[PDB]
């Protein structure tokens, strides 16, 4: 039974099951705001991911989804460092991740992208970090002459150097979280039936 090949093939399969189960759990804790459960599941997800020796496209997407949720959960923590470049704030790191998944769902993707960009600037402005807002803006909106949705609105706001703006009340941190929770509901609909959870659910049903 201990044929190395067959064992290697089986362990890849089992690790995929564990990864999916842990992503499911991370998503639910995220949605529910179960902060301690989220931390535990995160530690487990991280270890399981570090243990992988191979990646299907589905596994890579699942890793991205876990990374995305951990950046978003830390979005107001301007001192948390998720990239080698210590300048990159957590919501900027979330944006970079988002730029690798769900592109084919273009309307929801654009909506979430825009809200993250808005709040990447808002969290700096509301902290009184006006210079950092300017630097974030430059990194996420590219060439100053390039045009992008909400860019000119955000430049006006940054230039006024006030910790409060009405625009950030409408496109708020809570509104961003709600759109992201909608995306999380979608991941849940797709993954709530994966092997490990479905098997566990019938044991306790």
């Amino acid at each position: 039974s201990e044929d190395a090949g067959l064992v290697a093939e089986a362990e890849a399969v089992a690790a995929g099951w564990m990864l999916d189960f842990l992503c499911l759990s991370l998503c639910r804790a995220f949605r529910d705001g179960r902060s301690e459960d989220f931390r535990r599941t995160r530690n487990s997800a991280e270890a399981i991911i570090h243990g992988l020796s191979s990646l299907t496209a589905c596994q890579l997407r699942t890793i991205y989804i876990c990374q995305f949720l951990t950046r978003i959960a830390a979005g107001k923590t301007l001192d948390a460092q998720f990239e080698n470049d210590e300048r990159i704030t957590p919501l900027e790191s979330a944006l970079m991740i988002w730029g690798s998944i769900e592109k084919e769902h273009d309307k929801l993707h654009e909506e979430i992208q825009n809200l993250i960009k808005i709040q990447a600037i808002a969290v700096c402005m509301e902290n009184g970090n006006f210079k950092e807002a300017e630097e974030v803006f430059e990194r996420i909106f590219g060439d100053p002459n390039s045009h992008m949705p909400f860019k000119s609105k955000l430049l006006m706001i940054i230039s006024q150097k006030d910790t409060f703006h009405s625009f950030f009340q409408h496109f708020s941190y809570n509104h961003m979280m709600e759109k992201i929770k909608s995306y999380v509901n979608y991941v849940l609909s797709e993954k709530s039936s994966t092997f490990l959870m479905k098997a566990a659910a019938k044991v306790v049903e």
Binding site: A45, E46, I49, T70, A80, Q81, F82, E86
Partner: peptide, 12 residues
């Protein structure tokens, strides 16, 4: 590479 858990900008 930073995976799921972050470092602290306010250190060293």
């Amino acid at each position: 590479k930073i995976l799921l858990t972050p470092r602290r900008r306010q250190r060293l």
